[PDB]
Amino acid sequence: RLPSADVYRFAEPDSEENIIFEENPIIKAGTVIKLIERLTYHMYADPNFVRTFLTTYRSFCKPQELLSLIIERFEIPSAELKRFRKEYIQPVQLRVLNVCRHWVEHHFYDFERDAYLLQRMEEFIGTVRGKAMKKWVESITKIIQRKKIASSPPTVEWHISRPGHIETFDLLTLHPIEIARQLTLLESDLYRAVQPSELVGSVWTKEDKEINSPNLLKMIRHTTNLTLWFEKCIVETENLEERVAVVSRIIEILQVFQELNNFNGVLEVVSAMNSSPVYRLDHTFEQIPSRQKKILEEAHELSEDHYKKYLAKLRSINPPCVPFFGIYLTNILKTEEGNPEVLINFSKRRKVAEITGEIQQYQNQPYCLRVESDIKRFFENLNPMGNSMEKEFTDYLFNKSLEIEPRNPKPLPRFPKKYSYPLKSPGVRP
Ligand SMILES: Cc1c(C#N)cccc1[C@@H](C)Nc1nnc(C)c2cnc(N3CCOCC3)cc12
């Protein structure tokens, strides 16, 4: 029934040297030729294989090479001749177009990063002149052209800085309710923009990390800037009574971060408070009320163990949420290092793809908050390091900490004020 190997490379049957399954199918390993064959199997459909493959195929196959394989598998060279066209030719051709649907619909970034890859896809779909494959070709063409063309929020809160005067925006001049709202809207968009393929194969820690993981790095370096900006506002406020107001305001921003389920912002404040320059400021935290001490304690307990307390709280809240990327990136690297690579190992890619879907399920629901473009651009313009590098700026923050609160033998100096506006916080309630 089946052709030969010279005419069709997908003719060699399954054996121990190609395709390896698990216990009861679910594929564990195999060659790329066999991975495409089972991805387009004629006896049944497998949507779980398609979604996991197209998400993790770039870890073992290249996009230009994948298109050449699905086209090679598509172009297959009368008691059985009419049956072979219905039991093998027609169903396999439908499975190839099904992958093409899922490829352009959910992984279109591969095409807008390689124009030659998209041109070949449009030429292949144009050559498909079947009869039953018409509705699939129509759907593929519609998705391609669509991709190429591609209640009431509450009142915005203001404190000292009047609206429109972006030149006076600061941590104490802006309302802490609005600081967390805009940072939540800012971080939510940075989270929703991350594609799962940017986490497969540790591509964000390799050579081409900018073009393969453009959205993940932008999410990471934003967390670094806002954390360092929190630490910079604290240590550079030499006045003790003024630094207490700075830290207390960041605790109030954590309160709103918790009301909006922005766990990235909560742990950004946590990471800034646990940093070496901020954690040793014993004189500052003594004047912080016990109510704000408990809030920082509970937020830190989310980081104990492997964020297991954060995971438990995440599984008990609802849509409007901004997850934390760190705990998932850690579990991916240990899995991508624990499991090997070849036995090629596909259960490793599946195990990594299972982790991506856990943090991806919150990438749909938006926040019922109105965007403030001036406040948004202010936080987008944040660059606390400046010209200095990462290690040189963190060493400055700690030396600034050893200066504003010298260690045990030295006394505690008194420093002049730096903020001329009132320091009383407006409030945490809308
Ligand atoms: C509550 C608070 C305050 C005050 N007041 C002031 C600052 C921070 C915090 C939180 C956010 N950090 C922590 N909280 N509770 C424990 C039991 C912690 C135990 N260990 C740490 N680590 C910090 C990093 O180096 C290793 C030790 C942090 C803890």
Side-chain angles (χ1 to χ4, degrees), residues 182-238:
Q182 294 300 326
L183 285 172
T184 298
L185 291 170
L186 201 159
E187 292 169 14
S188 182
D189 297 334
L190 294 180
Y191 158 73
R192 297 164 90 264
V194 177
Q195 296 295 334
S197 184
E198 311 178 30
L199 289 71
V200 179
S202 178
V203 283
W204 77 93
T205 333
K206 295 281 99 180
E207 188 187 54
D208 299 74
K209 61 174 63 62
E210 209 285 332
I211 57 178
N212 282 325
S213 305
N215 302 273
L216 178 57
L217 294 186
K218 179 157 49 63
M219 177 71 171
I220 294 175
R221 67 171 174 263
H222 166 79
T223 297
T224 305
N225 286 337
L226 194 61
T227 299
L228 294 176
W229 180 69
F230 280 144
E231 306 173 15
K232 182 183 180 180
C233 295
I234 293 179
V235 300
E236 288 184 347
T237 302
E238 297 88 359

Coordinates of all heavy atoms in Angstrom, one line a residue, residues 182-238:
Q182 N -0.8 52.3 36.9 CA -0.1 52.4 35.6 C 1.0 51.4 35.5 O 1.2 50.9 34.4 CB 0.4 53.9 35.5 CG -0.6 54.9 35.4 CD -1.5 54.7 34.2 OE1 -1.1 54.3 33.2 NE2 -2.8 55.1 34.4
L183 N 1.7 51.1 36.6 CA 2.7 50.1 36.5 C 2.1 48.7 36.3 O 2.7 47.8 35.6 CB 3.6 50.1 37.8 CG 4.6 51.2 37.9 CD1 5.3 51.2 39.2 CD2 5.7 51.0 36.8
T184 N 0.9 48.5 36.8 CA 0.2 47.2 36.5 C -0.2 47.1 35.1 O 0.0 46.1 34.4 CB -1.0 47.1 37.4 OG1 -0.6 47.1 38.8 CG2 -1.8 45.8 37.1
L185 N -0.8 48.2 34.5 CA -1.1 48.2 33.1 C 0.1 48.1 32.2 O 0.1 47.5 31.2 CB -1.9 49.5 32.7 CG -3.3 49.7 33.3 CD1 -3.7 51.1 33.1 CD2 -4.2 48.7 32.7
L186 N 1.2 48.7 32.7 CA 2.5 48.6 31.9 C 3.1 47.2 31.9 O 3.5 46.7 30.9 CB 3.5 49.6 32.5 CG 4.7 50.1 31.6 CD1 5.2 51.4 32.1 CD2 5.8 49.1 31.6
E187 N 3.1 46.6 33.1 CA 3.6 45.2 33.2 C 2.7 44.2 32.7 O 3.1 43.1 32.2 CB 3.9 44.9 34.7 CG 5.1 45.7 35.3 CD 5.2 45.6 36.8 OE1 4.6 44.7 37.3 OE2 5.9 46.4 37.4
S188 N 1.4 44.4 32.7 CA 0.4 43.5 32.1 C 0.7 43.4 30.6 O 0.6 42.3 30.0 CB -1.0 43.9 32.4 OG -1.9 43.0 31.8
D189 N 0.9 44.5 29.9 CA 1.1 44.5 28.5 C 2.5 43.8 28.2 O 2.6 43.1 27.2 CB 1.1 45.9 27.9 CG -0.3 46.6 28.0 OD1 -1.3 45.8 28.1 OD2 -0.3 47.8 28.1
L190 N 3.5 44.1 29.0 CA 4.8 43.4 28.9 C 4.6 41.9 29.1 O 5.3 41.1 28.4 CB 5.8 44.0 29.8 CG 6.2 45.4 29.6 CD1 7.3 45.8 30.7 CD2 6.8 45.6 28.2
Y191 N 3.7 41.5 29.9 CA 3.5 40.0 30.2 C 2.7 39.4 29.0 O 3.0 38.3 28.5 CB 2.8 39.8 31.5 CG 2.0 38.5 31.6 CD1 2.7 37.3 31.7 CD2 0.6 38.5 31.5 CE1 2.0 36.1 31.8 CE2 0.0 37.3 31.6 CZ 0.7 36.1 31.7 OH 0.0 34.9 31.8
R192 N 1.6 40.1 28.6 CA 0.8 39.5 27.5 C 1.5 39.4 26.2 O 1.1 38.7 25.3 CB -0.5 40.4 27.4 CG -1.4 40.4 28.6 CD -2.4 41.5 28.5 NE -3.7 41.1 27.9 CZ -3.9 41.4 26.6 NH1 -3.1 42.0 25.8 NH2 -5.1 41.0 26.1
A193 N 2.6 40.2 26.0 CA 3.3 40.2 24.8 C 4.4 39.1 24.7 O 4.9 38.9 23.6 CB 4.1 41.5 24.6
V194 N 4.6 38.3 25.7 CA 5.6 37.3 25.7 C 5.0 36.0 25.1 O 4.0 35.5 25.5 CB 6.1 37.0 27.2 CG1 7.1 35.8 27.1 CG2 6.7 38.2 27.8
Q195 N 5.7 35.5 24.1 CA 5.3 34.3 23.4 C 6.0 33.1 24.1 O 7.1 33.2 24.5 CB 5.6 34.3 21.9 CG 4.9 35.4 21.2 CD 3.4 35.1 21.1 OE1 2.9 34.0 21.3 NE2 2.6 36.2 21.0
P196 N 5.3 31.9 24.1 CA 5.9 30.7 24.8 C 7.2 30.2 24.2 O 8.0 29.7 24.9 CB 4.8 29.7 24.8 CG 3.5 30.5 24.5 CD 3.9 31.6 23.7
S197 N 7.4 30.5 22.9 CA 8.6 30.0 22.2 C 9.8 30.8 22.6 O 10.9 30.4 22.4 CB 8.4 30.1 20.7 OG 9.6 29.6 20.0
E198 N 9.6 32.0 23.3 CA 10.7 32.8 23.8 C 11.3 32.2 25.1 O 12.3 32.7 25.6 CB 10.3 34.2 24.0 CG 9.5 34.8 22.9 CD 9.1 36.2 23.2 OE1 9.7 36.9 24.0 OE2 8.0 36.6 22.6
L199 N 10.7 31.1 25.6 CA 11.2 30.4 26.8 C 11.7 29.0 26.5 O 12.2 28.4 27.5 CB 10.1 30.4 27.8 CG 9.7 31.7 28.6 CD1 8.9 32.6 27.7 CD2 8.9 31.3 29.8
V200 N 11.6 28.5 25.3 CA 12.0 27.1 25.0 C 13.5 27.1 24.6 O 13.9 27.9 23.8 CB 11.1 26.6 23.8 CG1 11.5 25.2 23.5 CG2 9.7 26.7 24.2
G201 N 14.2 26.2 25.2 CA 15.6 26.0 24.8 C 16.5 27.0 25.4 O 17.7 27.1 25.0
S202 N 16.1 27.8 26.4 CA 16.9 28.8 27.0 C 17.4 29.8 26.0 O 18.5 30.2 26.0 CB 18.0 28.3 27.8 OG 18.8 29.3 28.4
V203 N 16.5 30.2 25.0 CA 16.9 31.1 23.9 C 17.2 32.5 24.4 O 17.9 33.2 23.7 CB 15.8 31.1 22.8 CG1 15.9 29.8 22.0 CG2 14.4 31.2 23.5
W204 N 16.7 32.9 25.6 CA 16.9 34.2 26.1 C 18.3 34.3 26.8 O 18.6 35.4 27.3 CB 15.8 34.6 27.1 CG 15.9 33.9 28.5 CD1 16.5 34.4 29.6 CD2 15.4 32.7 28.8 NE1 16.4 33.6 30.6 CE2 15.7 32.5 30.2 CE3 14.6 31.7 28.2 CZ2 15.3 31.3 30.9 CZ3 14.3 30.5 28.9 CH2 14.6 30.4 30.2
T205 N 19.0 33.2 26.9 CA 20.3 33.2 27.5 C 21.4 32.7 26.5 O 22.5 32.3 26.9 CB 20.4 32.3 28.8 OG1 19.0 32.2 29.3 CG2 21.3 32.8 29.8
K206 N 21.2 32.8 25.2 CA 22.1 32.4 24.2 C 22.6 33.6 23.4 O 22.6 34.7 23.8 CB 21.5 31.4 23.3 CG 21.1 30.0 24.0 CD 22.3 29.1 24.2 CE 22.9 29.2 25.6 NZ 24.1 28.4 25.8
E207 N 23.1 33.3 22.2 CA 23.7 34.3 21.3 C 22.6 35.3 20.8 O 22.6 36.5 21.2 CB 24.4 33.7 20.1 CG 25.2 34.7 19.3 CD 25.7 34.0 18.0 OE1 25.0 33.4 17.3 OE2 27.0 34.1 17.8
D208 N 21.6 34.8 20.0 CA 20.6 35.6 19.5 C 19.4 35.6 20.5 O 18.4 35.0 20.3 CB 20.1 35.1 18.1 CG 21.3 35.1 17.1 OD1 22.2 34.3 17.2 OD2 21.3 36.0 16.2
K209 N 19.6 36.4 21.5 CA 18.5 36.5 22.5 C 17.6 37.7 22.2 O 16.5 37.8 22.8 CB 19.1 36.7 23.9 CG 20.0 37.9 24.1 CD 20.5 38.1 25.5 CE 21.3 36.9 26.0 NZ 22.5 36.7 25.2
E210 N 18.1 38.7 21.4 CA 17.3 39.9 21.1 C 16.2 39.6 20.1 O 15.1 40.1 20.3 CB 18.2 41.0 20.7 CG 17.7 42.4 21.0 CD 16.6 42.9 20.1 OE1 16.5 42.4 19.0 OE2 15.8 43.7 20.6
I211 N 16.5 38.9 19.1 CA 15.5 38.6 18.0 C 14.7 37.4 18.3 O 13.6 37.3 17.7 CB 16.2 38.5 16.6 CG1 17.2 37.4 16.6 CG2 16.8 39.9 16.2 CD1 17.9 37.3 15.3
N212 N 15.2 36.4 19.1 CA 14.4 35.2 19.4 C 13.5 35.4 20.6 O 12.5 34.8 20.7 CB 15.4 34.0 19.6 CG 15.9 33.4 18.3 OD1 15.1 33.4 17.3 ND2 17.1 33.0 18.3
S213 N 14.0 36.2 21.6 CA 13.2 36.5 22.8 C 13.1 38.0 23.0 O 13.7 38.5 24.0 CB 13.8 35.8 24.0 OG 13.9 34.4 23.8
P214 N 12.4 38.7 22.1 CA 12.4 40.2 22.3 C 11.5 40.7 23.4 O 11.7 41.7 24.0 CB 11.9 40.7 20.9 CG 11.0 39.6 20.4 CD 11.6 38.3 21.0
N215 N 10.4 39.9 23.6 CA 9.4 40.3 24.6 C 9.8 39.9 26.0 O 9.4 40.5 27.0 CB 8.0 39.8 24.3 CG 7.6 40.2 22.9 OD1 7.0 41.3 22.8 ND2 7.9 39.5 21.9
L216 N 10.4 38.7 26.2 CA 10.9 38.2 27.5 C 11.9 39.1 28.1 O 11.9 39.5 29.3 CB 11.3 36.8 27.4 CG 11.9 36.2 28.7 CD1 10.8 36.3 29.8 CD2 12.3 34.8 28.5
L217 N 12.9 39.5 27.3 CA 14.0 40.4 27.7 C 13.5 41.8 28.1 O 13.9 42.3 29.1 CB 15.1 40.5 26.7 CG 15.9 39.3 26.3 CD1 17.0 39.6 25.4 CD2 16.4 38.6 27.6
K218 N 12.5 42.3 27.4 CA 11.9 43.6 27.7 C 11.1 43.4 29.0 O 11.1 44.4 29.8 CB 11.0 44.0 26.6 CG 10.3 45.3 26.9 CD 9.9 46.0 25.6 CE 9.1 45.1 24.6 NZ 7.9 44.6 25.2
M219 N 10.6 42.3 29.3 CA 9.9 42.0 30.6 C 10.9 41.9 31.7 O 10.7 42.4 32.8 CB 9.1 40.8 30.5 CG 8.4 40.4 31.8 SD 7.0 41.5 32.3 CE 6.3 40.6 33.7
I220 N 12.1 41.3 31.4 CA 13.1 41.1 32.5 C 13.8 42.5 32.8 O 13.9 42.8 34.0 CB 14.1 40.1 32.0 CG1 13.4 38.7 31.9 CG2 15.3 40.0 33.0 CD1 14.4 37.6 31.4
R221 N 14.2 43.2 31.8 CA 15.0 44.4 32.1 C 14.1 45.5 32.6 O 14.6 46.5 33.3 CB 15.7 44.9 30.8 CG 14.7 45.4 29.7 CD 15.6 46.0 28.6 NE 14.7 46.4 27.4 CZ 14.7 45.6 26.3 NH1 15.3 44.5 26.2 NH2 13.9 46.0 25.3
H222 N 12.7 45.4 32.4 CA 11.8 46.4 33.1 C 11.8 46.1 34.6 O 11.8 47.0 35.4 CB 10.4 46.3 32.5 CG 9.4 46.9 33.4 ND1 9.2 48.3 33.4 CD2 8.5 46.4 34.2 CE1 8.2 48.6 34.2 NE2 7.8 47.5 34.8
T223 N 11.7 44.8 35.0 CA 11.7 44.4 36.4 C 13.0 44.9 37.0 O 13.0 45.3 38.2 CB 11.6 42.9 36.5 OG1 10.3 42.5 36.0 CG2 11.7 42.5 38.0
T224 N 14.2 44.8 36.3 CA 15.4 45.3 36.9 C 15.4 46.8 37.1 O 15.9 47.3 38.1 CB 16.6 44.9 35.9 OG1 16.5 43.4 35.7 CG2 17.9 45.2 36.5
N225 N 14.9 47.5 36.1 CA 14.9 49.0 36.2 C 14.0 49.5 37.4 O 14.4 50.3 38.2 CB 14.5 49.6 34.9 CG 15.5 49.5 33.8 OD1 16.7 49.4 34.1 ND2 15.1 49.6 32.6
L226 N 12.8 48.9 37.5 CA 11.9 49.4 38.5 C 12.4 48.9 39.9 O 12.2 49.7 40.9 CB 10.5 48.8 38.3 CG 9.4 49.5 39.1 CD1 9.3 51.0 38.8 CD2 8.1 48.8 38.8
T227 N 13.0 47.8 40.0 CA 13.6 47.3 41.3 C 14.8 48.3 41.7 O 14.8 48.8 42.8 CB 14.1 45.9 41.2 OG1 13.0 45.0 40.9 CG2 14.7 45.5 42.5
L228 N 15.7 48.5 40.8 CA 16.8 49.4 41.0 C 16.3 50.8 41.3 O 16.9 51.5 42.1 CB 17.8 49.4 39.9 CG 18.6 48.0 39.7 CD1 19.5 48.1 38.5 CD2 19.4 47.7 40.9
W229 N 15.3 51.2 40.6 CA 14.7 52.6 40.9 C 14.1 52.6 42.3 O 14.2 53.7 42.9 CB 13.6 52.9 39.8 CG 13.0 54.2 40.0 CD1 13.6 55.5 39.8 CD2 11.7 54.5 40.4 NE1 12.8 56.5 40.1 CE2 11.5 55.9 40.5 CE3 10.6 53.7 40.7 CZ2 10.3 56.6 40.8 CZ3 9.4 54.4 41.1 CH2 9.3 55.7 41.1
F230 N 13.5 51.6 42.8 CA 13.0 51.5 44.1 C 14.2 51.6 45.1 O 14.1 52.4 46.1 CB 12.2 50.3 44.4 CG 10.8 50.3 43.9 CD1 10.2 49.2 43.4 CD2 10.1 51.5 44.0 CE1 8.9 49.2 42.9 CE2 8.8 51.5 43.5 CZ 8.2 50.4 43.0
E231 N 15.3 50.9 44.9 CA 16.4 51.0 45.7 C 17.1 52.3 45.6 O 17.7 52.8 46.6 CB 17.4 49.9 45.4 CG 16.8 48.5 45.4 CD 17.8 47.4 44.9 OE1 19.0 47.7 44.8 OE2 17.3 46.3 44.6
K232 N 17.1 52.9 44.4 CA 17.8 54.2 44.3 C 17.0 55.4 45.0 O 17.7 56.3 45.5 CB 17.9 54.6 42.8 CG 18.6 55.8 42.4 CD 18.6 56.1 41.0 CE 19.4 57.4 40.6 NZ 19.4 57.7 39.1
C233 N 15.7 55.3 45.0 CA 14.9 56.3 45.7 C 15.1 56.2 47.2 O 15.0 57.2 47.9 CB 13.5 56.2 45.4 SG 13.0 56.5 43.6
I234 N 15.5 55.0 47.7 CA 15.6 54.9 49.2 C 17.0 55.3 49.6 O 17.1 56.1 50.5 CB 15.4 53.4 49.5 CG1 13.9 53.0 49.3 CG2 15.7 53.1 51.0 CD1 13.6 51.6 49.6
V235 N 18.0 54.8 49.0 CA 19.4 55.1 49.5 C 19.8 56.5 49.2 O 20.6 57.1 50.0 CB 20.4 54.1 49.0 CG1 20.0 52.7 49.3 CG2 20.5 54.2 47.4
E236 N 19.3 57.1 48.2 CA 19.6 58.5 47.8 C 18.8 59.5 48.6 O 19.0 60.7 48.4 CB 19.5 58.7 46.3 CG 20.6 58.1 45.5 CD 20.5 58.4 44.0 OE1 19.4 58.9 43.6 OE2 21.4 58.1 43.3
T237 N 17.9 59.1 49.5 CA 17.2 60.0 50.4 C 17.9 59.9 51.7 O 17.6 59.1 52.6 CB 15.7 59.6 50.5 OG1 15.1 59.6 49.2 CG2 15.0 60.6 51.4
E238 N 18.9 60.8 51.9 CA 19.8 60.7 53.1 C 19.1 61.1 54.4 O 19.4 60.6 55.5 CB 21.0 61.6 52.9 CG 21.9 61.3 51.8 CD 21.5 61.9 50.4 OE1 20.4 62.6 50.4 OE2 22.1 61.7 49.4

